[PDB]
């Protein structure tokens, strides 16, 4: 209630000063971007948010910075042939930036307060609050989802692993390119290789445990696995009772359907009509998206994520919302299929699902962050069919 609004008010007061920032920079022929300042503000923030997850915190303040630079670039458009004068500008260093610094610190204070009091968040309130800002949907989505994860606050799994050296890894094997079976029928994909490298680092052997999108969290709650990987989206709902690793992929949801359909389905407004038959796989973020985002289209839940795309080819449904990486893979695999939208509508990251053991999470992240620094995922991604655009 109270904290949520205050949080939104402070975030909006910052963005509202950004036209003034852009005018000063336009006057002094400065660029929007200033990496010095960005770095420094992000260290200041990290050091001041110790009790909060530092990945979620950096993503949240990171997307505020993106939003702010997008507003600046909109102003830049409007300034091209103007005569800005001293009289028209406000001081960047004595006026605006002090104000922005104060607001940032007040946002941190509200974060910590909300984090300790279990302030609940409402997407409708957020939407209403930021509706007038001139911001692409993914960035708006990102701000809300990241704020949700920041504000989300125990097993002895690592202790057991250290004794038995046997890592039980949950996989769905129904999401190419993350986890699937190859034409010999062996487990394959990004997440098979990542889990193999994690096990190797810790000197564990892997036991593979089959799970599903409908039974993921019950399986996790019953401790049927230690970790799980299969392109699993990081969500505040899934961090109710489990934990995640650092993210290893960033994207979000788009739509796929037939190329012969594109000119009638190339916008969310065109997709969400009662004519349109939506198909979706049960029990994960695809389902939770289409149930929340659509008001008109009909919604069929198809049992098997492996054969769902054939329904679009066959003409028994018209569109599916899924992750951008999956849509682009399936649009390459199927001549008749096309990505329908120009860009994704949501912000979402993939991570390793973990039993809630702090010490497990700590070790896994240390490994993962280092691993990502050193290879490109890009190449692992590309080996399982993912065009590195
Ligand atoms: Cl994606």
Numbering used by the authors: 24 to 176, 181 to 416
Q: Anything the authors wrote about it?
A:
Chorismate mutase (CM) and cyclohexadienyl dehydratase (CDT) catalyze two subsequent reactions in the intracellular biosynthesis of l-phenylalanine (Phe). Here, we report the discovery of novel and extremely rare bifunctional fusion enzymes, consisting of fused CM and CDT domains, which are exported from the cytoplasm. In γ-proteobacterial fusion enzymes, the CM domain is N-terminal to the CDT domain, whereas the order is inverted in β-Proteobacteria. The fusion enzymes of Aequoribacter fuscus, Janthinobacterium sp. HH01, and Duganella sacchari were crystallized and their structures refined to 1.6, 1.7, and 2.4 Å resolution, respectively.
To investigate the relative locations of the active sites within a single polypeptide, ∗AfCMCDT, ∗JbCDTCM, and ∗DsCDTCM were crystallized, and their structures solved and refined to 1.6, 1.7, and 2.4 Å resolution, respectively, and Rfree/Rwork values of 24.8/20.5%, 24.3/19.9%, and 25.8/23.0%. Like ∗MtCM, the CM domains of ∗AfCMCDT, ∗JbCDTCM, and ∗DsCDTCM form six-helix bundles with a single active site in the N-terminal moiety. In ∗AfCMCDT, representing the ∗CMCDT topology, the presumed substrate access to the CDT domain faces away from the expected product exit site of the CM domain, with a distance of 35 Å between active sites. A full structural assessment of the domain interface in ∗AfCMCDT is precluded by the poorly resolved linker region. In fact, there is ambiguous electron density for residues Pro177-Asp180. This may suggest a more flexible connection of the CM and CDT domains for ∗AfCMCDT than for the topological counterparts ∗JbCDTCM and ∗DsCDTCM, for which the linker regions are clearly resolved. Still, residues Asp164 and Lys168 from H6 of the CM domain of ∗AfCMCDT interface extensively with the CDT domain. There is no indication of dimer formation of ∗AfCMCDT; however, we noted a right-hand shoulder of the main peak, which could be due to conformational isomers, e.g., due to partial unfolding. The coupled CM+CDT reactions showed that equimolar concentrations of the active-site KO variants ∗AfCMCDT and ∗AfCMCDT complemented each other perfectly and reached a catalytic activity (kcat = 2.8 ± 0.2 s−1, Km = 9.2 ± 1.5 μM, kcat/Km = 3.0 ± 0.7 × 105 M−1 s−1) that coincides, within experimental error, with that of wild-type ∗AfCMCDT. This result directly suggests that the enzyme fusion does not provide a catalytic benefit.
